Each structure stands twice: as structure tokens, then as C-alpha cells.
């Protein structure tokens, strides 16, 4: 991804969650950027109690993942927009997604010298693995590899 966010939010009535997410989204569109994926997660129990705008500590919070394509200039604006919203407890930001840690160290990349387009195409989920991932995806990966490489040109040279 170009940018990503993890947004720890207060667990409110659904109409409010939807309004808040519409506000963040519109704040991203106005600033001339895109949303790769807005992923929803449940109301979880974190390891740290968060206080909201009421200064009332919270045991539970709704987690929400943002993945954005912006300019680095106007994500300052979106940053202090998101962090200043009352329904967001915490937001952590990943800017490292284009050059993550495991590449371009003493010619680790075979047949290319730092191809940037490898990790840009990808989403955050495949750059940073989630805990549930097991050896099983090693299977799926390749059925999604081989299959892809079969249909790509034929699909592209159609139009």
C-alpha cells in the first residue's frame, strides 16, 4: 500500500459509526486520494483501556483498518483530521509499506535491484502477515499464482 491506518474507535450505535467513517472517507476524497480497502473488524478487548472524549476509560473498542493512496503533503491534513475526530481513540500510521524492512539489503533481490512496484501493487495483508496464517496459504498462493499467470495477458489484450 502507499499508506495505512489502524483506527481504534469507540463502540457506538451503528448510525454514528457509519457517519464517522463517511466523514473520514469524504475527508480522503476531498484531498484527492483513494481508498484501497476500508476493512471492518469487531468490537474487541484491547490490552490497554482507552479513554474517550468523555475521559471515561473504555474496556472495549471497535477496530477499523484504512488503506490509502495519497500525496504525502495532504495526508498531513487527513492525519490531523482523523486524530482530531471524537470517535477515534487511537490511530497508528504505517508509512513503511512501499519499502518494508525485508527487501533491498545486500542484493537480496534476485534478477532486479529494488523493484518498487512489487510492494505497491500488494495490500497490507500480504506484506504483514496476520497470526492465523498457516502453511495452508502456501497452497492457495500458488493456485492464485499459476492461475493468474495463465489468464493475465489474454484478459488484458482483449480490449
Amino acid at each position: 500500500v502507499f499508506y495505512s491506518f489502524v483506527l481504534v474507535m469507540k463502540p457506538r450505535q451503528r448510525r454514528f459509526t457509519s457517519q464517522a467513517l463517511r466523514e473520514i472517507g469524504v475527508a480522503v476524497y476531498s484531498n484527492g486520494g483513494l481508498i484501497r480497502s476500508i476493512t471492518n473488524e469487531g468490537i474487541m478487548r484491547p490490552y490497554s483501556r482507552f479513554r474517550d472524549a468523555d475521559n471515561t476509560p473504555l474496556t472495549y473498542a471497535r477496530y477499523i483498518i484504512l488503506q490509502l493512496d495519497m500525496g504525502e503533503e495532504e495526508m498531513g491534513k487527513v492525519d490531523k483530521i482523523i486524530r482530531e475526530h471524537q470517535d477515534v481513540l487511537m490511530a497508528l500510521k504505517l508509512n513503511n509499506l512501499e519499502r518494508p524492512v525485508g527487501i533491498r539489503s545486500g542484493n537480496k533481490e534476485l534478477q532486479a535491484a529494488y523493484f518498487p512496484l512489487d510492494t505497491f501493487t500488494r495490500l497490507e495483508e500480504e506484506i504483514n502477515w496476520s497470526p492465523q496464517t498457516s502453511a495452508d496459504i502456501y497452497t492457495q498462493l500458488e493456485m492464485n499464482w499459476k492461475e493468474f499467470s495463465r489468464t493475465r495477458w489474454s484478459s488484458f489484450l482483449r480490449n
Binding site: 495490500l123 492464485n144 499459476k146 495463465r150 489468464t151
Partner: protein
């Protein structure tokens, strides 16, 4: 009367070497022969 003949040495020395040497004058396919043919089931292509 017979005798041991000294075999004049081959260029490549093994058949595997034969294939590989032959293979540089050729174009590899992107996909191996067993998966080129489309599956009998249908795989909807998603993003990775």
C-alpha cells in the same frame, strides 16, 4: 583379435546436459505443461 578401444569423449557427457544445452536455443513457456490447460472447476481470479 579384439582390444579395448579408447572412447572418443562426448561433448556434453550426460543427457540432462543435452537438454539444458539444447534449451538455450529455445523459448521456455511461462507455465509448465501440466498446468496450462484450464481447470475443470473455475477459479475466479481475485487480487492476491
Amino acid at each position: 583379435t579384439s582390444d579395448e578401444s579408447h572412447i572418443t569423449p562426448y561433448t556434453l557427457g550426460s543427457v540432462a546436459a543435452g537438454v539444458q544445452r539444447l534449451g538455450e536455443h529455445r523459448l521456455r513457456y511461462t507455465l509448465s505443461p501440466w498446468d496450462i490447460t484450464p481447470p475443470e472447476d473455475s477459479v475466479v481470479l481475485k487480487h492476491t
